[PDB]
Symmetry: C3
Subunit: 339 residues, 3 copies
């Protein structure tokens, strides 16, 4: 919804209301939980033509949970998703700064396409893999305008010394390179950052640097969407041990995500996917699967404003998992109005 378009400046207001319910047995031992998961999003996205070569931009988006009471829990799960501003010049590149996606998400975004679930390794506030505060990101499209389809990025992660180790990080650098051709896309991305003293002080995890990288392929054409990600992390993936009630990072993980989807012209978009994340070298445990499931699902698009969906997670995690990770299935049912 364009609310302003005079000369230089264009502003869009956008939002959505998501009626959403999760069904699981009982559901504290399930993949996704059980009960109402309704939420809403509001945001703006703006762009100003400063001169013939230079554009300025900003974006903001907030999440308002709709599954809280109006009492003490009213704000649970509310947060800023995105908040950044930047500048883009000609065929030189773009620079933005704020709360934005980590550069490894350039790869992980390939498989973050499921109706409701998926994208399990793109954790928020986790270095370079998901949403993260205080990133400066340089992006180049079409390699200075010389090589069509060839993009790269360089990202500096500023340190965020927060109260919890889960949500903190030290200074870091990361980058990504991407090539797209005839409906395919190839991507690789890598970042390394320091860990904070509060992260080192955690039982689970040990080392001075956190590292994350991932590669991916996608195909996105002729009504088909197929993608695969591979990734490895060092001291970056957050974990909990529900037996020892302790927490930290995984010394190492290996991550695989696959998705295949077809879009029928009358609106139905079935989805199948697989996701497997395994950790290693975990103080008091050894090797343990963090995520392991098959997904079968569908979205029905009535048009670009209205959709409904069912997302079924066949959870392959075992009831004996050493970290306590839930092993039951979850199915989501969603109805979405957006503008």
């Amino acid at each position: 919804a364009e609310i302003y378009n005079k000369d230089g400046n264009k502003v869009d207001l956008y939002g959505k209301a998501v009626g959403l319910h999760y069904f699981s047995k009982g559901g504290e031992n399930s993949y996704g939980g059980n009960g109402d998961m309704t939420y809403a999003r509001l945001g703006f996205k703006g762009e100003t033509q400063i001169n013939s070569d230079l554009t300025g931009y900003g974006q903001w988006e907030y999440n308002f949970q709709g599954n809280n009471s109006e009492g003490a829990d009213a704000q649970t799960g509310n947060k800023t998703h995105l908040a950044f501003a930047g500048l883009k010049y000609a065929d030189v590149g773009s620079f933005d700064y704020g709360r934005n996606h980590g550069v490894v998400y350039d790869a992980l975004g390939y498989t973050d396409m499921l109706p409701e679930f998926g994208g399990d390794t793109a954790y928020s506030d986790d270095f370079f893999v998901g949403d993260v505060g205080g990133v400066a990101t340089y992006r180049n499209s079409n390699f200075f305008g010389l090589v069509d389809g060839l993009n790269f990025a360089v990202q500096y992660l500023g340190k965020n010394e927060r109260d919890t180790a889960r949500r903190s990080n030290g200074d870091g650098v990361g980058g990504s390179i991407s090539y797209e051709y005839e409906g395919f896309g190839i991507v690789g991305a890598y970042g390394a950052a320091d860990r904070t003293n509060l992260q080192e002080a955690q039982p689970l995890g040990n080392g001075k640097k956190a590292e994350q990288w991932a590669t991916g392929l996608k195909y996105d054409a002729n009504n088909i969407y197929l993608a695969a990600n591979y990734g490895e992390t060092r001291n970056a993936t957050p974990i909990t041990n529900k037996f020892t009630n302790t927490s930290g990072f995984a010394n190492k993980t290996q991550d695989v995500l696959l998705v295949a989807q077809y879009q029928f012209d009358f609106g139905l978009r079935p989805s199948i996917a697989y996701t497997k994340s395994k950790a290693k070298d975990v103080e008091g445990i050894g090797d343990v699967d963090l995520v392991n499931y098959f997904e079968v699902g569908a979205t029905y698009y009535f048009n670009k404003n209205m959709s409904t969906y069912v997302d079924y997670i066949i959870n392959q995690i075992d009831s004996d998992n050493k970290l306590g990770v839930g092993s039951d299935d979850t199915v989501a049912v969603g109805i979405v109005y957006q503008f």
Copy 2:
């Protein structure tokens, strides 16, 4: 404020800023309290024409309190009022899901018309009587298009197992039927739900099912608004005992609400009302009035964007009330800008 209207999709942004002050003696023993009560609302309401018979819709509304400091109390009273999405077909009905009004509010809305106060039994997060998370609601207008003025609804309340008993509920079903003719409206509505284990574990209240029903009449025509509600609840109305510092639900209540109002063409709308809510079978007490007052008030509408109002509550609750319910009067003064 329509911010988009192209072909299928219409989106309205709406909001208001309410400068509001409550005057009571001292005011911890008063009906409404004392001090600044300023707040603001923002929302969106959208509608998409999917085909000739089928429309999609969404609505979201948030409350931002304006009577908090910017310190630790900044978010007190902030919350999502509404957040839902749905579909409406032809002369078959509508279905929506999310945070929405309980179906008994179809009746109680009849008397929830006072400038500031009123609607005292339409508690939020209380089964079917007010705002509630995780409801699916089927609505039929004009009985499949066969009987003009005859509407009904069926609502399934999904369970919300929250940290407090006050804000929780179990699975439930409810319905309402309504008939309107020559400026009158007749309504009845009933819902029953299970209570959670955390609700059963509360001192005040006992039983496995919560029930709420209400009937109402209104007249709304020739510049007059007159309405009456009657209702009864079992194990549903929340209560506190300020002597024993305990809390729970009332085993039973009986509720009466009356309102009469006249709208002068130059803008003044005087209001008088009566509200009485009495509980029964309360562990350690017996019978006790929850609400008991006369209201005299007026709104002045300058136009549809700007209004001012005074709302006087003559509180008939006694200083000896057994639950500690406040007995002093309260008067509100409000100035409202909305769009």
Copy 3:
């Protein structure tokens, strides 16, 4: 961004996304701190022409911090900046009520012009000097339309009995008078209010009334902005003692703020400023500087939507300060998209 303009009613939606980073040594002993300071603003401002002499209005603005994780700290620093509604008549005056600027801010606003910092004595939730809840404000423009450039205001501060003494206040009255001529402006403003029992009970500070006043001059013309404020407070300025971990108000302060700025036509706006705030009669200390710095800074305006800035605070506070006030420098770097 005007989202509605039909006949009587005009509504603007406004907002901004501020990518912002503070650099200080380490930075718990610095002026501004260290790390990401990204935030966003959203608001609306509306105005209705009720008749030829009478206009109605409302404004709301919220601050959403973008430097929080999505965990427990998600809402830190979020708040309502402004929330009020009012009426303006002909050449009689305006009246509004809500969360608005204290009338002493009529003076202090003169020097609150720095790219990022500055305006250090316009504390929020501090009687009349900054943002404050529950104020009713009468304003007269051009002295009933008789004396061009001559404005005054009268403000009644309603009592806000909050959980902390820092954020509370008692009933109070304040006023301001202002004269503008040939690019100059002269202002004086005074307010006095009662303190609450919780404020009296604080170690630092003693007395039954809080008082704040300030005068100022500005020049704002020919691309130059020059301003000076002087102010004195009694029992109003909040203070902390980081040695004794105690808090309260200063028995007295004296405040000086100066700013000079030049706006080049191609967009660069350099700024220099000085700010000094000194307290007196502080239980267990005597005299101590609260603020003391030089500022050198610049904004580059690409256009009215996009800007960038650097703001350098040369902090003159000493490492031995008796209240523990930080003594290190801070520099901010900001990139701003607004509409």
